[PDB]
Amino acid sequence: IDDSLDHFIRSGAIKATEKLSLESINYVLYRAEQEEYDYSEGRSGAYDIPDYGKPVYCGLQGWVSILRKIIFYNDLAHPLSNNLRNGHAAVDYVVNRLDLYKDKEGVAEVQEWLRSRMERIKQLPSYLVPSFFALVVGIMYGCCRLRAMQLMSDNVGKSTVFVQSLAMTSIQMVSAMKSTSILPDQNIAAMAAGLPHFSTNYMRCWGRDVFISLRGLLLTTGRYEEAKEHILAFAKTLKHGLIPNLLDAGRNPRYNARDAAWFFVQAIQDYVTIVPGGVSLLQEKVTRRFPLDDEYIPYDDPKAFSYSSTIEEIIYEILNRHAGGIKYREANAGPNLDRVMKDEGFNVEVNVDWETGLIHGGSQFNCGTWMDKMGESEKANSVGVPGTPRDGAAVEINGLLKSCLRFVLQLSKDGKFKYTEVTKPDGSKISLSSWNDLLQENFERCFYVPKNKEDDNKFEIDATIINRRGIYKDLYRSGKPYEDYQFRPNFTIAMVVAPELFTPDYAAGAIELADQVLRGPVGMRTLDPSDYNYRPYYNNGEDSDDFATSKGRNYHQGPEWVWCYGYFIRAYHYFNFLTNPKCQVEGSAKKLKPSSYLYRKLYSRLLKHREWIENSPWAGLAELTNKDGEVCNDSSPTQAWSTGCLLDLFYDLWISYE
Amino acid sequence: AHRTLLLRLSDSGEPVTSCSYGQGVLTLPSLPLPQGKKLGDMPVYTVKLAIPAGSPVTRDGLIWTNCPPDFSTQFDREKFYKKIIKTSFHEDDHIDLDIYVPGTYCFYLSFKNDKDELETTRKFYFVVLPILSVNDKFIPLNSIAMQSVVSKWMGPTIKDWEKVFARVASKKYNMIHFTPLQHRGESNSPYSIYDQLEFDPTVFKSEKEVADMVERLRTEHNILSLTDIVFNHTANNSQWLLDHPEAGYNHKTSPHLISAIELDKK
Amino acid sequence: GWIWDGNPLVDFASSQSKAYLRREVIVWGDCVKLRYGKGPSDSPYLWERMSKYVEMNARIFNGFRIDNCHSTPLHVGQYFLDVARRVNPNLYVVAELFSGSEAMDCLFVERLGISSLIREAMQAWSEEELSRLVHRHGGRPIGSYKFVPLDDFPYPADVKIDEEYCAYNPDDHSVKCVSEIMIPKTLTATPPHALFMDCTHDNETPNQKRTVEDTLPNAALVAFCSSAIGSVYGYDEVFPQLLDLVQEKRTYSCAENTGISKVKTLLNNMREEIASEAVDIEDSEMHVHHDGQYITFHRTNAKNGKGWYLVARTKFHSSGDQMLPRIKLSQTKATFKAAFSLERTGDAPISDEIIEGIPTKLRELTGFDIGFDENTKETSILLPQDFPQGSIVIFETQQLG
């Protein structure tokens, strides 16, 4: 110890983080042990602290999540404190693990600073190592966290801890790997669905999760060049006019996702709206590594890189082939894809009822929507029975379709979209504006459930199968018609993406019920608690005979999901600002801005989320919660859409009122 | 708002110099337009001309300027507009000149001689600088950093050109100078232009292809583009030189060079 | 082509000249001179062709750059720039203009509507010549006088008054009067704006004319001027030799962040912060000092006390060790911003299909001592003896009061 040691430990950390990137910061702060194994061939992983366990990340966050409470109470008796006195192994671990990432941008310089300081720490008496270890880790952590805020956009860089803690999940989820990627020919940055189990090999990338999260994690933060690459990487995998959910790095993906293609085109609109010059995305040319029809997996055939498709025609191809109709049994169908799905479930069909203009699809043997839990309990007799098949008109799918139509209409107006016709299965043509005004007229009719019995004669209502009035149906003419009239948070997605389809008073009053019924403390209840099928506890290990709960069929009927809370409160915001006058105030220059009464309401519904990300060993939000905030031991501890959809809300408020 | 300047004139209609900055030009300040407003919405600047009371120019005095009197009216260098000079022996006259579009404007005075003839002062020019925005980020003319790049050394592809764009955008230039992008003549120099009316076919296909690349520079890298323009000559192998040899100096057009032709042919 | 020392205002292919007969032409057989007459009536295709030529690029680009604009006839240049301005009213016109005098240079800017004249820094023959060049385009002197209406103005009793100087909205972007009496800001002849190039595509590379080290101080000196700046690609990339526009076909190297590239990133971003803090000619002051192979540049805003101080040890030649006296700044506080040294690491690569610059080390420097006497309020600035030729340091300064 000398008077210069003090200045040595607190200096040089900002210069070390200089050449870092929002990608490379992932390798310094996070990296789940499974993500670490991916780079270490299974050799390394997370440091096992004796009489304690391992930090949840191999990076500095793993240390910080433990050290914060230790520094606060001076817990010199903590197992980590003891271990840091008895040896220099945790001291060396911090430095050595970066050998795995020494080649990535700025890590070599960060590693040298850590190395230079750690070596000087080891030359101290054993009882002084813990404090200097925690001090050095804390300093480099902050500088990396600062670098993240500098690289991200203003709205993130000037915000509260809670907003920044949300934004750091974008770094948790976006990294390059060795076992998987988003492109087949390269290994590049690929957004995981969540940590730790949705991070490696085929389990990492999921098209539904990528694009639902793309706006929040990538656009709200400013990672545009990373949002583009994820969009283009799925553009290559378009087939059946649909986007796959199981992106196998663009190498034999699974196409049972009726949802992904419309969240995909939604993100494209979000990209174009937000990115300065984002219209440039439309003319971007992509190598279409599949055929224009829908043949079969030919990843090695020379027809892979055969032809090119611009995002312009890629958007149109989704719209056109959807109208013209799509018929196909999934390629390579059989057990080698789903060892529990029945033979008729691999047959997926989707078309448009042109008397309404909305989109129907699926069956009682399918899981085409985000609620895609397939049962498997042999003892409970549910092998092959989808827990929530959502066949027919799904609210979001059509709401997302209206958003797409509204997008391409105003787009062609500006000379950026050359398409106007659309071919029907017979041979008819319909303008996009005609299809648009079709949904505008028929949507709220087919989906609303009036509060007054008098109005049932106008909204195609079968009052025998109802539960609550003043609601938008979850589905339209499905398989089980009582599943049409279930209160589910899914309708909030359509309210967010295409609010033109909703009359303000109906949407306002409907979402006030979700506030009283479907809104948990952190999660959105996936099913009205008054329904008979309501089972809000999810055990993917239950062996018993219960037809509902065994092998986790409850996944989408009761359990409280967090990413739906994002789409909910975004609409809760929009329609409480349009409807209730107490939620409005004459903002500067008389433009309409929300009042403190509305802000106070939004604030009270995010406290339980701030509490969660604060007291979470993984510095993020769970993917799922059991009834009334109870921790679901099978829920992923950090998920992308869980945080990316709260960021969605903050960007709304920012991009509109600040 | 207040976007007016005072251009005092002498008793002979010459502009008064307020400070000695050296030999210069009557340039108005480089300023962005007000909040969210277009060139049509308001006069860019207002030049208030001050005429001295009882000066010789006040006798039937008129101000003539090629400054269009409306935003709708286009600018013709040779079309001038009349403004009457309010004659007083005690009070000066002031004459606003509303300006709606950047460019070069000029003004002179006409008055009645001491022989009751019509006399005219010299033309006096003043300049309105353009308003350079990149993405609604105003760029003052004194903060421009321009990169000169020669296209025939930027590789053969548009994709091979955006590599140079990103390199200079990292060095934080905000404007790129483009050596002429048209089909070059025999000796392949960028300034000897084969055809001035379409671009280099080795890299470009249509006018839209270059306008989109230039716009791509504007939105992805916040960089503005400008090109060389050659007026003094064309390349010695223009396909239109055969259809139009009079655009140069011939034995027909410029006969004095006949004595000079037979000196090179000898 | 061009006559040797001839007036560029005289068409040497016209009746008033015998230069083709008398052989006084240095010629370009490459290009063929175009004959505009007294108007379009004298060459109706050429005028119609050039018009659509102008009108095409005016739809695309943001402005023009006119080669040997002095040799272009006046009425011609006026006609087409007016045509372009009808297409692109925010047209930015640049010109390498060297007519017979400054008065004529100003006359061209008047009638053509030129927005900036091009000035080159590589034309400097010695350290002082550069310092003068930099003094010309550096700004006004520090502590320079400001203009007020005095006893040469009428004071109308009914003149509008901004009592307490408070009738200017920062978003109206108004032209502020000198004080409370609202006598409008005076339209006075100012010198035409300059675009200072540290090196053009017609200039010999610093390797050729001086050495490669000057690429750092030269560019810093130019960038500290109160004007638009510019550079050719390869100057920062430290190319070894001026590219022949005719013969060469090699391609720009993809080697990123070479030579000065990191410094021009700093400079331009540094000038981006200064942005709209200086509008009229008296808002940006300066002080340039020449001492041997050192050149000092102090840049000052006349309203706010912020400033930047550049010490540049130039390398025109390897001219030995020279020690600069302690820099003294009265009633000013200084702060270290950045410092760099450029040193050549062997000769340039020899390639046939790609043009690559000279390998350079952009070494960061230390050892600068900034003493401040809390009594006399005088900041002293000392340089380290490790300050080789081709190095710069930049200080942020701030006047007190």
XYZ file of N, CA, C and O in Angstrom, chain B residues 120-235:
464
model
N -28.958 56.857 -64.145
C -28.999 55.558 -63.491
C -27.673 55.279 -62.800
O -26.602 55.456 -63.392
N -27.748 54.880 -61.532
C -26.564 54.520 -60.771
C -26.082 53.128 -61.176
O -26.670 52.458 -62.031
N -24.990 52.685 -60.559
C -24.480 51.346 -60.817
C -25.373 50.300 -60.157
O -26.067 50.574 -59.173
N -25.356 49.092 -60.715
C -25.989 47.958 -60.055
C -25.179 47.555 -58.827
O -23.956 47.403 -58.900
N -25.862 47.384 -57.697
C -25.236 46.955 -56.451
C -25.871 45.652 -55.991
O -27.090 45.585 -55.795
N -25.040 44.631 -55.811
C -25.471 43.272 -55.521
C -25.368 42.965 -54.032
O -24.467 43.446 -53.340
N -26.312 42.161 -53.544
C -26.222 41.558 -52.221
C -26.629 40.094 -52.331
O -27.456 39.728 -53.169
N -26.036 39.259 -51.482
C -26.151 37.809 -51.589
C -26.887 37.266 -50.372
O -26.627 37.685 -49.237
N -27.799 36.328 -50.610
C -28.475 35.577 -49.558
C -27.947 34.148 -49.603
O -28.164 33.426 -50.583
N -27.252 33.741 -48.545
C -26.671 32.411 -48.499
C -27.768 31.347 -48.430
O -28.864 31.605 -47.924
N -27.499 30.145 -48.934
C -28.455 29.041 -48.778
C -28.565 28.600 -47.322
O -27.822 29.043 -46.444
N -29.520 27.706 -47.074
C -29.787 27.165 -45.741
C -29.576 25.658 -45.836
O -30.465 24.924 -46.285
N -28.396 25.193 -45.428
C -28.014 23.789 -45.551
C -28.427 23.035 -44.292
O -27.838 23.227 -43.224
N -29.446 22.190 -44.414
C -29.782 21.208 -43.395
C -29.428 19.818 -43.905
O -29.378 19.581 -45.115
N -29.163 18.898 -42.985
C -28.767 17.543 -43.341
C -29.870 16.529 -43.033
O -30.185 15.672 -43.860
N -30.465 16.616 -41.849
C -31.666 15.895 -41.434
C -32.392 16.818 -40.462
O -32.638 16.484 -39.306
N -32.717 18.018 -40.942
C -33.330 19.073 -40.138
C -32.381 19.541 -39.037
O -32.800 20.178 -38.066
N -31.099 19.214 -39.201
C -30.010 19.735 -38.385
C -29.344 20.821 -39.213
O -28.682 20.528 -40.213
N -29.536 22.072 -38.810
C -28.980 23.174 -39.574
C -27.460 23.102 -39.557
O -26.845 22.818 -38.527
N -26.854 23.360 -40.709
C -25.403 23.375 -40.840
C -24.985 24.809 -41.151
O -25.270 25.309 -42.249
N -24.331 25.510 -40.229
C -23.776 26.822 -40.576
C -22.684 26.675 -41.623
O -21.923 25.705 -41.621
N -22.625 27.643 -42.539
C -21.661 27.566 -43.630
C -20.223 27.575 -43.123
O -19.316 27.169 -43.858
N -19.992 28.027 -41.890
C -18.660 28.062 -41.300
C -18.303 26.784 -40.554
O -17.201 26.698 -40.002
N -19.200 25.801 -40.497
C -18.898 24.525 -39.861
C -18.792 23.376 -40.855
O -18.772 22.213 -40.439
N -18.715 23.668 -42.150
C -18.670 22.626 -43.172
C -17.284 21.993 -43.217
O -16.265 22.693 -43.263
N -17.247 20.659 -43.200
C -16.041 19.876 -43.457
C -16.311 19.005 -44.678
O -17.088 18.046 -44.600
N -15.666 19.325 -45.795
C -15.952 18.695 -47.077
C -14.849 17.709 -47.444
O -13.662 18.016 -47.313
N -15.244 16.525 -47.903
C -14.312 15.504 -48.364
C -14.351 15.418 -49.884
O -15.408 15.156 -50.466
N -13.204 15.640 -50.523
C -13.078 15.412 -51.957
C -12.687 13.959 -52.200
O -11.719 13.460 -51.616
N -13.448 13.284 -53.058
C -13.186 11.898 -53.427
C -13.347 11.770 -54.934
O -14.304 12.301 -55.509
N -12.412 11.085 -55.576
C -12.497 10.828 -57.007
C -13.144 9.467 -57.218
O -12.714 8.466 -56.633
N -14.181 9.428 -58.060
C -15.018 8.235 -58.143
C -14.281 7.081 -58.811
O -14.412 5.928 -58.385
N -13.504 7.367 -59.859
C -12.816 6.304 -60.582
C -11.727 5.633 -59.754
O -11.078 4.705 -60.250
N -11.516 6.081 -58.517
C -10.583 5.462 -57.588
C -11.298 4.873 -56.379
O -10.636 4.457 -55.420
N -12.632 4.836 -56.400
C -13.434 4.307 -55.307
C -13.939 2.898 -55.591
O -14.909 2.454 -54.967
N -13.295 2.185 -56.509
C -13.750 0.878 -56.916
C -14.825 0.944 -57.980
O -15.280 2.022 -58.377
N -15.252 -0.220 -58.465
C -16.174 -0.277 -59.612
C -17.649 -0.432 -59.262
O -18.469 -0.463 -60.185
N -18.006 -0.527 -57.984
C -19.376 -0.801 -57.586
C -19.896 0.294 -56.664
O -19.128 0.935 -55.940
N -21.213 0.506 -56.708
C -21.864 1.368 -55.727
C -21.601 0.852 -54.319
O -21.330 1.629 -53.395
N -21.680 -0.468 -54.132
C -21.376 -1.050 -52.829
C -19.938 -0.755 -52.420
O -19.656 -0.517 -51.239
N -19.012 -0.763 -53.383
C -17.630 -0.377 -53.115
C -17.460 1.121 -52.893
O -16.374 1.549 -52.487
N -18.498 1.922 -53.137
C -18.432 3.350 -52.853
C -18.892 3.671 -51.440
O -18.317 4.547 -50.786
N -19.923 2.978 -50.957
C -20.408 3.197 -49.603
C -19.396 2.773 -48.545
O -19.560 3.138 -47.376
N -18.367 2.011 -48.924
C -17.250 1.771 -48.015
C -16.474 3.057 -47.761
O -16.030 3.312 -46.635
N -16.309 3.884 -48.797
C -15.623 5.162 -48.633
C -16.498 6.136 -47.853
O -16.002 6.920 -47.036
N -17.809 6.109 -48.107
C -18.738 6.978 -47.390
C -18.660 6.750 -45.886
O -18.587 7.704 -45.103
N -18.680 5.484 -45.462
C -18.623 5.179 -44.037
C -17.276 5.545 -43.423
O -17.214 5.901 -42.242
N -16.192 5.460 -44.199
C -14.888 5.856 -43.676
C -14.821 7.358 -43.428
O -14.307 7.798 -42.392
N -15.332 8.164 -44.361
C -15.279 9.609 -44.164
C -16.303 10.037 -43.119
O -16.071 10.994 -42.369
N -17.451 9.352 -43.052
C -18.431 9.663 -42.017
C -17.901 9.349 -40.624
O -18.341 9.964 -39.646
N -16.962 8.404 -40.512
C -16.300 8.164 -39.232
C -15.380 9.323 -38.877
O -15.338 9.765 -37.724
N -14.639 9.826 -39.859
C -13.816 11.016 -39.707
C -14.654 12.284 -39.562
O -14.088 13.378 -39.462
N -15.984 12.147 -39.571
C -16.936 13.189 -39.182
C -16.960 14.374 -40.140
O -17.254 15.499 -39.732
N -16.671 14.144 -41.415
C -17.043 15.127 -42.414
C -18.564 15.171 -42.540
O -19.266 14.203 -42.241
N -19.078 16.314 -42.988
C -20.514 16.479 -43.177
C -20.864 16.826 -44.614
O -22.019 17.167 -44.898
N -19.901 16.740 -45.528
C -20.149 17.025 -46.931
C -19.073 16.342 -47.766
O -17.907 16.301 -47.369
N -19.478 15.789 -48.906
C -18.576 15.090 -49.813
C -18.554 15.825 -51.144
O -19.611 16.130 -51.709
N -17.353 16.113 -51.639
C -17.168 16.709 -52.955
C -16.902 15.595 -53.959
O -15.953 14.821 -53.798
N -17.737 15.525 -54.991
C -17.675 14.478 -56.002
C -17.091 15.047 -57.287
O -17.677 15.952 -57.889
N -15.933 14.530 -57.689
C -15.435 14.785 -59.028
C -16.450 14.263 -60.047
O -17.157 13.289 -59.771
N -16.554 14.901 -61.217
C -17.705 14.673 -62.108
C -18.027 13.199 -62.319
O -17.149 12.390 -62.627
N -19.303 12.851 -62.145
C -19.744 11.463 -62.175
C -20.294 11.029 -63.534
O -21.028 10.039 -63.605
N -19.957 11.731 -64.607
C -20.454 11.381 -65.931
C -19.430 10.556 -66.706
O -18.259 10.451 -66.336
N -19.912 9.954 -67.794
C -19.081 9.183 -68.712
C -17.893 10.008 -69.185
O -18.063 11.105 -69.722
N -16.690 9.498 -68.941
C -15.467 10.227 -69.242
C -15.029 9.980 -70.686
O -15.389 8.976 -71.306
N -14.236 10.915 -71.214
C -13.771 10.868 -72.587
C -12.607 9.913 -72.780
O -12.398 8.977 -72.004
N -11.846 10.149 -73.855
C -10.747 9.258 -74.234
C -9.754 9.055 -73.093
O -9.555 7.932 -72.615
N -9.111 10.135 -72.655
C -8.004 10.029 -71.712
C -8.449 9.723 -70.289
O -7.601 9.706 -69.390
N -9.745 9.504 -70.062
C -10.304 9.022 -68.802
C -10.172 10.022 -67.658
O -10.415 9.658 -66.500
N -9.755 11.256 -67.931
C -9.753 12.284 -66.896
C -11.185 12.622 -66.483
O -12.075 12.709 -67.336
N -11.441 12.811 -65.184
C -12.820 13.076 -64.734
C -13.391 14.399 -65.218
O -14.615 14.577 -65.164
N -12.559 15.330 -65.683
C -13.038 16.644 -66.091
C -13.267 16.762 -67.591
O -14.010 17.652 -68.020
N -12.650 15.897 -68.392
C -12.986 15.780 -69.809
C -14.180 14.843 -69.907
O -14.041 13.624 -69.787
N -15.362 15.410 -70.124
C -16.614 14.670 -70.034
C -17.035 14.232 -71.430
O -17.196 15.065 -72.332
N -17.218 12.921 -71.603
C -17.800 12.357 -72.817
C -19.209 12.904 -73.005
O -19.473 13.643 -73.960
N -20.118 12.547 -72.100
C -21.502 13.003 -72.159
C -21.850 13.638 -70.821
O -21.779 12.974 -69.782
N -22.232 14.915 -70.848
C -22.648 15.608 -69.634
C -24.053 15.238 -69.174
O -24.441 15.625 -68.066
N -24.826 14.502 -69.973
C -26.248 14.334 -69.703
C -26.621 12.952 -69.179
O -27.803 12.708 -68.917
N -25.662 12.042 -69.023
C -25.906 10.823 -68.264
C -24.611 10.394 -67.585
O -23.511 10.741 -68.026
N -24.756 9.625 -66.507
C -23.648 9.319 -65.613
C -22.848 8.112 -66.092
O -23.178 7.461 -67.085
N -21.766 7.817 -65.359
C -20.845 6.714 -65.612
C -21.604 5.393 -65.674
O -22.092 4.908 -64.645
N -21.724 4.782 -66.857
C -22.463 3.512 -66.955
C -21.775 2.341 -66.279
O -22.455 1.369 -65.929
N -20.454 2.395 -66.088
C -19.747 1.319 -65.402
C -20.240 1.107 -63.975
O -20.041 0.021 -63.419
N -20.876 2.111 -63.371
C -21.276 2.045 -61.969
C -22.771 2.314 -61.841
O -23.464 1.658 -61.056
N -23.276 3.272 -62.614
C -24.657 3.724 -62.526
C -25.466 3.245 -63.724
O -24.923 2.892 -64.774
N -26.785 3.236 -63.540
C -27.730 2.896 -64.595
C -28.636 4.057 -64.973
O -28.784 4.365 -66.160
N -29.254 4.712 -63.994
C -30.158 5.821 -64.256
C -29.823 7.000 -63.354
O -28.991 6.913 -62.446
N -30.497 8.120 -63.628
C -30.438 9.271 -62.735
C -30.950 8.910 -61.345
O -30.462 9.434 -60.338
N -31.965 8.045 -61.271
C -32.490 7.625 -59.974
C -31.447 6.891 -59.141
O -31.449 7.002 -57.909
N -30.548 6.148 -59.788
C -29.557 5.376 -59.047
C -28.554 6.273 -58.329
O -28.099 5.932 -57.231
N -28.199 7.417 -58.918
C -27.274 8.321 -58.245
C -28.014 9.191 -57.234
O -27.516 9.435 -56.129
N -29.217 9.656 -57.579
C -30.001 10.443 -56.632
C -30.334 9.650 -55.372
O -30.419 10.226 -54.282
N -30.519 8.332 -55.491
C -30.794 7.521 -54.308
C -29.538 7.318 -53.470
O -29.600 7.333 -52.235
N -28.391 7.120 -54.123
C -27.128 7.019 -53.397
C -26.812 8.317 -52.666
O -26.381 8.297 -51.507
N -27.020 9.455 -53.331
C -26.781 10.744 -52.691
C -27.734 10.938 -51.518
O -27.340 11.428 -50.452
N -28.999 10.545 -51.689
C -29.937 10.596 -50.575
C -29.571 9.587 -49.492
O -29.786 9.849 -48.303
N -29.022 8.431 -49.882
C -28.561 7.460 -48.892
C -27.427 8.032 -48.054
O -27.343 7.777 -46.848
N -26.546 8.819 -48.679
C -25.527 9.543 -47.928
C -26.164 10.514 -46.942
O -25.658 10.709 -45.831
N -27.281 11.126 -47.335
C -27.907 12.161 -46.521
C -28.556 11.588 -45.265
O -28.537 12.229 -44.207
N -29.130 10.387 -45.352
C -29.909 9.840 -44.247
C -29.153 8.850 -43.370
O -29.400 8.810 -42.160
N -28.241 8.052 -43.929
C -27.527 7.060 -43.132
C -26.246 7.599 -42.508
O -25.811 7.070 -41.479
N -25.637 8.633 -43.094
C -24.375 9.162 -42.596
C -24.417 10.651 -42.291
O -23.385 11.208 -41.899
N -25.571 11.299 -42.441
C -25.716 12.736 -42.211
C -24.660 13.538 -42.970
O -23.975 14.397 -42.413
N -24.536 13.247 -44.262
C -23.542 13.875 -45.123
C -24.248 14.428 -46.354
O -25.088 13.746 -46.953
N -23.910 15.657 -46.729
C -24.432 16.297 -47.928
C -23.454 16.113 -49.082
O -22.258 15.891 -48.883
N -23.978 16.195 -50.302
C -23.196 15.917 -51.496
C -23.206 17.115 -52.436
O -24.234 17.777 -52.608
N -22.048 17.389 -53.037
C -21.935 18.349 -54.125
C -20.930 17.822 -55.139
O -20.043 17.030 -54.803
N -21.079 18.262 -56.385
C -20.270 17.778 -57.493
C -19.519 18.922 -58.162
O -19.958 20.076 -58.135
N -18.369 18.590 -58.748
C -17.754 19.478 -59.725
C -18.720 19.748 -60.869
O -19.578 18.925 -61.197
N -18.562 20.912 -61.492
C -19.286 21.253 -62.710
C -18.304 21.925 -63.657
O -17.701 22.946 -63.306
N -18.141 21.359 -64.849
C -17.219 21.882 -65.848
C -18.024 22.634 -66.899
O -18.929 22.070 -67.526
N -17.693 23.911 -67.086
C -18.323 24.762 -68.086
C -17.425 25.062 -69.273
O -17.930 25.276 -70.376
N -16.109 25.077 -69.066
C -15.170 25.609 -70.042
C -14.855 24.651 -71.183
O -14.271 25.090 -72.181
N -15.230 23.377 -71.087
C -14.786 22.428 -72.101
C -15.554 21.121 -71.977
O -16.191 20.841 -70.958
N -15.478 20.329 -73.045
C -15.950 18.954 -73.086
C -14.832 18.075 -73.633
O -13.831 18.566 -74.162
N -15.007 16.762 -73.511
C -13.959 15.838 -73.916
C -13.823 15.809 -75.433
O -14.770 16.091 -76.173
